[PDB]
Structure formats: C-alpha cells, structure tokens
Amino acid sequence: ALYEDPPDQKTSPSGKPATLKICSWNVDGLRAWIKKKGLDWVKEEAPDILCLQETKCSENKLPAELQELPGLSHQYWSAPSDKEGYSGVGLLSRQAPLKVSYGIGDEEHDQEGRVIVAEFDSFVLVTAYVPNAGRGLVRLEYRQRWDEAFRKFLKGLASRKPLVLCGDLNVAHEEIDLRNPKGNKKNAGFTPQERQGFGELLQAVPLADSFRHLYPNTPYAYTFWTYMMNARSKNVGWRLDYFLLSHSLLPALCDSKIRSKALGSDHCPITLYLAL
Template sequence: MKLLSWNVNGIRACLNKGLPDLLTSEQPDILCLQETKARAEQVELPLEFAGYHAHWNSAVKPGYSGVAVFSRLAPLSVRHGIGMEEHDQEGRVLTLEFPDFHLVNVYTPNAQNELKRLPYRMLWDVAFRDHLLALEATGKPVVFCGDLNVAHQEIDLARPKANRFSAGFSDQERDGFSQLLKAGYIDTFRHFFPDQTEAYTWWSFRGGARARNVGWRIDYFGVSPTLLPRLKSAGILADITGSDHCPVSLEIE
C-alpha cells in the first residue's frame, strides 16, 4: 500500500500545478492533503480522482486551513476533528478507520511570528497525542501523517542556529515531537534514513530558498511500533513542485 501526504497550500491552485499529475505518476492508494483552503463543494476534481473516496474537514473560517483524504479503499468510519470544540474549528484533523489500522491526517497549528501562538500550540500537541493514544487503545495501530509544523532535530533544517527560537524550531515544539516519539510512534523517514541531511519538505518562497535547498523537514509519516515490520519505504518527493511543500511517501505491507 502506498500513501502520500502533501501540504498543497490551496487545493484549487495546486490542481493547476501538478496535483493531477502526481496521482497519475505515483498511483497512491491513499492521498492525504493539508491546507486545502476550500470546502468540498468549492472544488471541481478532475478525472484523475475517479475511483477515490473523498473525505474533507474544512475550517469554519473560509479559505483557511483544512485537510482532505482520498482513498481507493472505503473506510469503515470517518471522524472529523479530535472531539474537542476548542481544537476543531480549523479543520485540522481527519481520522479514517480501515480494517488493519487508523489513518490520521493532520495539519498542526503554526506557532507564528514571535511565537505568539505557542501556548495554544502546546495545548494542541498534548491533545493530538492523546487522540492518537486513544485510537491505539482500541487495538488497531495508527498511521499519522501531515504537516506537523516542527523540525525535530538540527539536521531537519538548513540553518538550525539562525532559527533556534523561530516558529517550528522552538525548544517547546521540538520537545512536543519528542514526546510523540516517546509515546512509541516512529518517524518513518528517520527510521530508514537516520543521518541523512539536506532532506527537506518545505522551503520559503523568499530568496530562492528552494533552488538553494535552504529548507525544513516538517512533513511526516509516523506509525505505531507494531507496524514496524510492515514498513517497506519512506521518502521525500522533493522534485514535485506546485506548493511551498513537497509530498512525502510511505509504503507499507
């Protein structure tokens, strides 16, 4: 089974910037999108999406945030949000239950300039981790993916010293991701490539950052430890443009 995750920075724009081509070339069984910035009825999907079951969770605020999942296999159930009203207004989580696992697509809140939203972000990290653990407690393992808005280690961004107190690389956000790993979840890219550098998934639009590969790795696939024997590969599709992020992939038996 091949899974792809991509922060498209607006699905309507990305449909004209390579998203249909990605479906054709990669043929994913499941495609998870973040920052869709649209409701389902606002989007006319092209023929490449035929055969996929579509599920959306959009923000209350128009044109903001939002996630979507397109799956060849019909899920047993779909859950919007994490069941907490204070966290479910921005369309940031979709949970799909399949026969063998739970899939969670997430677009984590950004701590923003001067870390002004960091206190909320810390509450979010705990609530999201509790959501994953509650799913785990049902007896099925979890696959989570999306834009987690944090570069965990210094090798996960090009300029760690300059960004030491920036959103996405604050000590608090990095510790939040560490707590996720301590809960047992596996960063699949680092499982296969523990020491690889210059492997990024997001680049600023400013200053030719992408051409110079001055980026951050903030998009992830994470899995429960019981799925470790079934992992086949994890990757970063850095040559796919159309957004300030690139897709990430996971292949699992």
C-alpha cells in the same frame, strides 16, 4: 547541499511485498496546486491513499477535476467552521474506509479543519495539518495546548488499532531536520517547546518517525522551503511532513520517501510504503 531521495524499497524487512502506498502533501492552496498540475503528479504516483493539508478551499469550491479521479474515488474533506480560505485537510482513498471522523474530540481544537481519521481493516490512518506557532510566536501558547491534546488523542487511538499519522506536523524535530538550526531556535517550527512536544509525542503514544528510523543520519532531506529568497533552488528547507507509525507496524515498513522534485506547493509530497 542538494539532496537525492534513494530508490523506493518495496519489500518489507522480511521480504513481504508492499501492499499499501500512501502519499501525503501539504498543497498550500488546493485550487492553485491543481492549476500548477499537482493532480498530474498524483496520477503518476498512483497512491492507494492521498492525504492533503492546507487546502484553503470550502467543500462548495472543490474543483471538478477531483471527482474524475480514481482510483481515489472515496474522498473526505474538512474545513474550518468559521474562517474561509484557511487551513483545511482532505483524504482520498481507493477503497472505502470502514469509518471516517473529523477532529480529535476536543471542541477547542476542532474548529480549523485540521484532522481526518480514517479506519481501515488492519490499521487507523490520521492525517493532520498542525497549527503553526505563528510569526512572532503569537500562537505558541496555543500550539502547546494543541500538542498535549493531540498526543492524548493519538495515544488512545493507538491503544485500539495500529496507527499511521501523516501530514504537516509543523515542527522540525532535530537539527538535521532543517538547513539553519542556529538562526531558527526562536522561530515557529523549531522552538524548544515544539521540538519537545514532538519528542513527547513519539514516546507517549508511542510512535516512530518512519523516515528517520530508516535514514537516521541522512542530512539535507526536507519537505518544505519558503517561497522567498529562492530557498527551494538552494535546498534551504525544513522537514515538516512525516509518517509516524505505531511500533508494531515497523516490520510492515517498506520505505518512507521524500518526493523532492514534485512542484505545485511550498511543500513537496512524501510517500509511505507498507506491506500489510
């Protein structure tokens, strides 16, 4: 079945207006995504912060359009240390963060340009492109190691400031989170190990899945569709991109959106509204 995201709710559970709008988008080739008019869509969405994953683009090759682009003038980029055209994330913000850092503090896990940490006044924002378990589950052993390091890192951070984690977490948590649960239990993104790691993440930090917390029984809501077999036109997809929040931020939570119609990637963008 096809899916229609409900309208944006812009007041908090106590009627505070939303003050912060964060958008996150796995662009799967930043240059290609810009050629497919992604920035026009971003300009219209007008986020206060924009998080991009899988940029596949070194700092040298960042297209010129990205400077001419407030109110997202404070921009930060991370690329792998020795693997061109692979992975890569970015964070663009309207206001300058207090402090920015790259990676999680673990050399094993900080070589593929996957994590940017941006600290603001009232909270910390982490954006992440989690490593794929790979075809044939080749990288599943590595994925589990990543999962534990990432959880430990995020638990530490959240013990000091309220935390927002966004990005492509490369797992569909439960069977409502993808179209074909049956046929995918041994494929990357829906192995029992990856789903379990996501569950441990929610409990050990702790964090809440913003979208599921608000729409806990809404099926067919996905953020990814493989280019093959016209999957997107059939809405045969996966929910892989999330906003996870510290529990303390749940009374700030106004809405968590899925922008199903924005094209330019094999992921659509997601949008978080917070009253801060």
